Amino acid sequence: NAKVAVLGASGGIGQPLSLLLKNSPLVSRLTLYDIAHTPGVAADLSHIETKAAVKGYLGPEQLPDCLKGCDVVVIPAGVPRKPGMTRDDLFNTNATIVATLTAACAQHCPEAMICVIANPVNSTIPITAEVFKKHGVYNPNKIFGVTTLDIVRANTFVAELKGLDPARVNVPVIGGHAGKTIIPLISQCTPKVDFPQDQLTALTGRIQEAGTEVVKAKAGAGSATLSMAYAGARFVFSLVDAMNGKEGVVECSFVKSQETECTYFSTPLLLGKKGIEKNLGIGKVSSFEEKMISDAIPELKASIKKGEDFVKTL
Template identity: 85%
Template sequence: MFSRAVRPAASLARSFSASARSDARVAVLGASGGIGQPLSLLLKNSPLVSQLSLYDIAHTPGVAADLSHIETRAQVTGHIGPDQLGAALKGCDVVVIPAGVPRKPGMTRDDLFNTNATIVATLVDACARHCPEAMICVISNPVNSTIPITAEVMKKHGVYNPNRVFGVTSLDVVRANTFVAQLKGLDPARVNVPVVGGHAGKTIIPLISQCTPKVEFPADQLSALTGRIQEAGTEVVQAKAGAGSATLSMAYAGARFTFSLLDAMNGKEGVVECSFVRSEETACKYFSTPLLLGRNGIERNLGLGKLSAFEEKLVADAIGELKASIKKGEDFVANMK
């Protein structure tokens, strides 16, 4: 029996250790962007990665040349434009997709839909053609819609495997761990807060009652903490004042999830991460919960666990918005020409 409180294989330190070694080929689609570049740097630093394939519509040869000078084992290749997308994906074990436009002040993640939906659908179509068995990790927002888009595009090609498609919500966990640690004077590396639901506003549901180590907050402080975790992305967008969204912390969280997945694919046991995936845990077709990862992706969905009354209400309040976002993604693919 695996404990739901297993600390995820989140420590990037292990992923930079020479003892952690594999021969994974990883592609980053959107590698020249604000998330893509630092994410690619973190992946290049890891001995878990032997081949790092970088793709974008501009600047990728320069990013690849720059990273290729770093004294780690991963071989870096740069691919630019649609004509080179197939070559970027061929033989990949894991594909990470941060491609798309970032939020600006006043924008919600859903405002990104029209642009990013098309980008994600195009990239996933190429994945279905060139690396249909790869693990697909989608960072591009709105994740609540881009994961249904990913699933529907792969279904069209007859290659959809729900155990291999992940919406990367790790940044919500990273933020929850950090904010709880700050309030309680703890080491954030030793705090684990499961975050369930989706990846936008009130659909982000931190389960503080299941935090390891156990913590307690007065009702008003718990409400404020929950609200801060839910709107932390907006906090960064506003602080950057039009210069972008959360790129560095998102790159860290994306690398953390990728390393956990690679660890599990290599046979490491007890690897648990939260992710937005196909689910039967609630009334929503897709929902983020803690997942036990294995060699073939999701080994077991660990579910919601025991919720407090406060958390039960948060889940109930999120269902309507989540269902609408999921349907929006599905409808987009259904109406594609």
């Protein structure tokens, strides 16, 4: 019976994400929002033989109605990268978008789980938090920077190298969602996997640079869409399952954190009826992994600060 909104539903991520959500018996109502094309996307999805009632909304006049009653809001709304761009190069465009949409969430569904996909995630989650604080409704257990694609990628690449079924592989990925802030904890992988350091370093780089490589492959036609839909829906399903009282649901996500000096940071989170039930910690890590954590922290702090500073201007 979960009521889920997708903001940016007409986009590259939004459309297949909305499909996966409509296909799920976990979703009773699916409200779709965008500044273009949403009615057509809703009409299309509405024909699918599943229970979720689909409704489309177009333009800021209609946004409040999309949000009212929502249990979960997912926000792919934003501009994606061109080849040669960094995720930070998106900040100046996507800051405003996220700020405006999350302000609407704060006003119209302040109790919803808020799942931000729009890049750069390392700054857009701090923006969300500070927007919520401005409206007097910040709950740090309910705001999530979606990093699931990093984990999905780690699982796939590990499985490939060891000839495993990726369905049975779970790699914790910590830190943030840009470059060297993406920290895959291969030492914590299940099943246990042994790589010599040369191969381990290559694998870790491949995980870190995976998004950039898809941008390159699409040659100007955007970034990861279909695999993000997959990863985004996974995260939403875990969240909703947890909200329905399912036990033992764990996902990595970039959240308000006191695991390091960074005020936001991704670790495995036990999910529950209230959102974050418990931050499970970084855990025991290798020397290689500890140095990566150490190396990432300055970049993460700078990105958090940039987001916070922007909301100060609003």
